[PDB]
Amino acid sequence: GTVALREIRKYQKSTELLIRKLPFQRLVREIAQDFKTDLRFQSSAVAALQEAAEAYLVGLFEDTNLCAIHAKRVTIMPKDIQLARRIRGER
Amino acid sequence: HRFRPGTVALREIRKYQKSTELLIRKLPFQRLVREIAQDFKTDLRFQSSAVAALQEAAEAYLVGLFEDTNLCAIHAKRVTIMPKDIQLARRIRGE
Amino acid sequence: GYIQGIAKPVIRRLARKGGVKRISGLIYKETRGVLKIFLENVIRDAVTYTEHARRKTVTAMDVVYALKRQGRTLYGFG
Amino acid sequence: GYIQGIAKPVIRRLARKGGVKRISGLIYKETRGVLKIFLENVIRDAVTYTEHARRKTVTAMDVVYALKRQGRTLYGFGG
Amino acid sequence: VETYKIYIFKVLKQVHPDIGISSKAMSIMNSFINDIFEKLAGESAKLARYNKKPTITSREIQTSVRLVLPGELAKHAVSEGTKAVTKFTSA
Amino acid sequence: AKKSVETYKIYIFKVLKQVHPDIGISSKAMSIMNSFINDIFEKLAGESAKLARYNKKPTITSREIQTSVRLVLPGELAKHAVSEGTKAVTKFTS
Amino acid sequence: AMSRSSKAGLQFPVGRIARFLKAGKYAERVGAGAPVYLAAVLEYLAAEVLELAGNAARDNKKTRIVPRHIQLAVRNDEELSRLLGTVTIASGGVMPNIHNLLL
Amino acid sequence: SRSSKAGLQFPVGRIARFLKAGKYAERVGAGAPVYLAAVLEYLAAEVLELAGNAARDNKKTRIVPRHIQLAVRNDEELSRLLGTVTIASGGVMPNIHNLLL
DNA sequence: ACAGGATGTATATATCTGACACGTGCCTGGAGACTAGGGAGTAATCCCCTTGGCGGTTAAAACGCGGGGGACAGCGCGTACGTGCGTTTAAGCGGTGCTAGAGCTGTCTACGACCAATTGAGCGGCCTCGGCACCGGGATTCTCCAG
DNA sequence: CTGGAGAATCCCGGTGCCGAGGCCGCTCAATTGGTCGTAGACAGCTCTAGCACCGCTTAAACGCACGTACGCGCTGTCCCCCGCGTTTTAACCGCCAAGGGGATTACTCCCTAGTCTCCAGGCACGTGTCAGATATATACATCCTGT
């Protein structure tokens, strides 16, 4: 379990985005296809969406890790994420 | 004597979830509010409706906090809430 | 201080209203601390609102606006 | 849909960014669900903003305002 | 002091003829109406400000309703607003 | 020619050169600082508008801005900002 | 002289809402269609909340709406709860919620 | 100019024009834009000084979003003011829990 | 698992009661008709940028095979927290008494909206070159495992 | 636990890039000087409502006994994710081309701001009572302990 700590240090030290650009763009366009058909996205809009999604996911995983450590565990589990969403008021 | 395993705890839970009146003692809460407001501005006078509104807000906030603390404490397979549960519930909320 | 006036059974009844079934002995201090912090924030905002209006009497509307600032709107007080 | 395109190692890297030492095998589905919910909300607000202006191109300002609606203000993209 | 007490009472007698409303509930409903109206007006002000137009028309109110009210509430409110405006224009 | 978007980049650069004599600033950092300034200005103006509306006064004076600063900025930031504003107004009116 | 509320078929004060929009300085100009739309939206929301509160009151065999009934109406319906997630209602109490593991 | 009178580096006139055009209030005092400009200048100076200190601790002479993120999160009151704000391309604060190690 | 008893919980009555629905009076802002002026709408035109395509790398995801540590269930002991029960002790009720400031009105002035003339501060564009991203290459520190 | 030892790490120096910093038009917005209207500073009045005290009741807090349930540590087990080597996939870079749509310009004009008239809906205030609580009088569901 040392490579996990090495990756944690390496990724907390970095700034660039982690989500693959093209799959995320496909996902965004597919989601927006339902609300309004025949849309065209600016590249900066997709970049802003990707940055917001990364920040939200990182915050959610920080809170989930806190919940998992609180239960005297290290392996985060879906119940941890569900509790972290319930407490935040997002659900 | 009589039933003492914790049944009265559930009975109180039902009774106080059904009720609606205020629970915090009015006079000590008024003293606490005046003491807190003493620091920010000397010689303040509170309308009774202002104190009642503060009491309602405090009751709602504490009830919400204890609901979240109960969720946290049950999440850890325990029943009795503990100070670390409240600390976690506050930390997650991002107040 | 006057914070000690909030007795144990009041906190017990508040917790029972929140669904909790058993309460540790160390919860009571933490509950008073959190209550004091919340009241301090709300009263500080209310006092700022009042000092703005050149009054020495904190009214219900000032407390309602102070709560509305924190995203904890209160209905039924105007 | 295309939500499954988000590769598992990407979610692992995101979790490692947040300081997580182990990940259960079932996290990779709940994460996708939550991400899709959040994106759906933000895209709904941005698309409403764009439809109001009659444009068919969703600009960066629309997404920034949509994020600002949810209390997730974004700096560094104007506005 | 001007409040929506009379109109709220008229609506209540329109939906539930035999049920009255107490003073506290009337105050709660008045505060709720004021808060919703404030939210909608603020959102319409922001919408007019972003597009630089100085006029609030029914379109701005409709977009504000879609942005504020969630889901089926938004859909029904938009339907009601369009119906009322359509009746008002022709009469 | 193209229409221009008015921003605080020049003034932020001036302030940076005033506090740090040699350190520059990249485009992304400048954009972040500009958005931060715009957001703070919008918050303060909105709170001042609400404070004016509550007391029915139609005018925004230095007093409303000072109260809004005390409301929004927390603690030592509020105190320093209030002192800076008071000093600026005092120097201006002379 | 039919009032604008009569023309729209509503029951809410269209004129008063237009006056509030103009006085609040939300925008430089206010269209003639905005107050009618806003009155209709507000009336629909008030009708929905009062209908739910009245149903709750009839469930408890009480013929007068009280803050407890409005609290029940707000917290039961999912969409209204989402709209009023953080709103505190005075004297309204809380929803009955006892966890399974605590029984 | 009003900025020269008040001693501020910020555009007092531009802030007054923004207050007027934004329709925040029907009238604007003569002293309000000066006060607002002073507050904005102080906040910008604070954040830029913290970012510059962070940059000098990293052996760099060009502020970058990572430095501003570090300056915002390390400082307490600024972090409390910008709790929900997301800074694009800013990374996260280095934090590993005690039990993980 | 069943039963008898003790105990909260609910149903039904007279008995009181004040909050609410109702009726009366007064007033200011809503409705209507008139004026004008400019924001909206529609059409045209330009060209900027977003979508789609092609093609070759090549980063990197997917898959799979150990195995180790940790999640989880189970076990026990220890202690402290819930539930009475007797004993204070201030909360709560009312009544009085005083007066500070909420709230309103009336003057009358200093202050801000508003018009135009003037001109320079800031913005776009168009440049140049130094800070930094990158890449080897070597010295240094950390994790791991046989001994 | 204690020394190899291998992999990751940082420190140092050379290369080349391209984005930051400065300077040149010039434009539209900041400023100055009046002018005029009114919101606000300031004084003064009225009396509502908040603060303080005192005496009495008793509801509820407080101290204590106690014993049972639940928290916490320890043990054993198996399973599931981490590490890693390999194969397979498609992200991505680079360039090309189209044209759809965003950004202005111009004209027209329809709608909304502003104003004067009029008065009826809306708000404050007296009024009666009928839907609310409340305690006594039984009926009924539910937990405890023993069988």
Numbering used by the authors:
A (entry chain F): 45 to 135
B (entry chain E): 40 to 134
C (entry chain H): 25 to 102
D (entry chain G): 25 to 103
E (entry chain D): 63 to 153
F (entry chain C): 59 to 152
G (entry chain A): 16 to 118
H (entry chain B): 18 to 118
Task: Provide the authors' original text about this structure.
Excluding archaea and few instances of eubacteria 2–4, roughly 147 bp DNA is wrapped around an octamer of two units of histones H2A, H2B, H3 and H4, forming nucleosomes in eukaryotes 5. One exception is the gene locus LOC_Os05g38760 (MSU gene model). This gene locus encoded a previously uncharacterized histone H4-like protein that we named as H4.V. Sequence alignment indicated that H4.V resembled H4 in length (103 amino acids) with similar histone fold domains albeit with minor modifications. The histone octamers were insoluble when folded in vitro with H4.V but were soluble when the N-terminal end (53 amino acids, accounting for most of the variation) of H4.V was fused with C-terminal 50 residues of H4 (named H4.VS throughout). In order to investigate the differences brought about by the residue variations to the nucleosomes, we performed single particle cryo-EM analysis of nucleosomes reconstituted using recombinant histones with either canonical H4 or H4.VS.
With recombinant H4.VS or H4 and H2A, H2B and H3 from rice and Widom 601 nucleosome positioning DNA sequence (NPS) 47, we successfully reconstituted nucleosome core particles (NCPs). Processing of the datasets using the standard CryoSPARC workflow yielded three-dimensional maps for H4 and H4.VS containing nucleosomes at 3.6 Å resolution. Interestingly, when the structures of rice H4.VS NCP and rice canonical NCP were compared, unlike H4 NCP, both entry/exit DNA regions of H4.VS NCP were well resolved. In correlation with the stabilised entry/exit DNA regions, both H3 αN helix and the H2A C-terminal tail were well resolved in the H4.VS NCP. Hence, we concluded that H4.V stabilizes the entry-exit DNA of the nucleosomes. Interestingly, H4.V has an Alanine to Valine substitution at position 33 which appears to stabilize the H3 loop connecting the H3 αN helix and α1 helix. Stabilization of entry/exit DNA regions observed in the H4.VS NCP are consistent with our biochemical finding that the H4.VS NCP (due to the residue V33) is relatively more resistant to MNase digestion when compared to canonical NCP. The same results were observed prominently in a 120 ml size exclusion column with intermediate effect in H4.VS V33A NCP, signifying the variation of compaction between the H4.VS and H4 containing histone octamers. This observation of compact H4.VS octamers corroborated the cryo-EM observations of stabilisation in H4.VS NCP. H3-H4 tetramer complex of H4.VS NCPs denatured at a 5 °C lower point when compared to H4 NCP tetramer unlike the H2A-H2B dimers. Overall, our structural characterisations suggest that the H4.VS NCP’s protection of entry/exit DNA from unwrapping and the distinct acidic patch features might contribute to modulating key interactions with chromatin remodellers and chromatin readers/writers involved in specific reprogramming of transcriptional regulation.
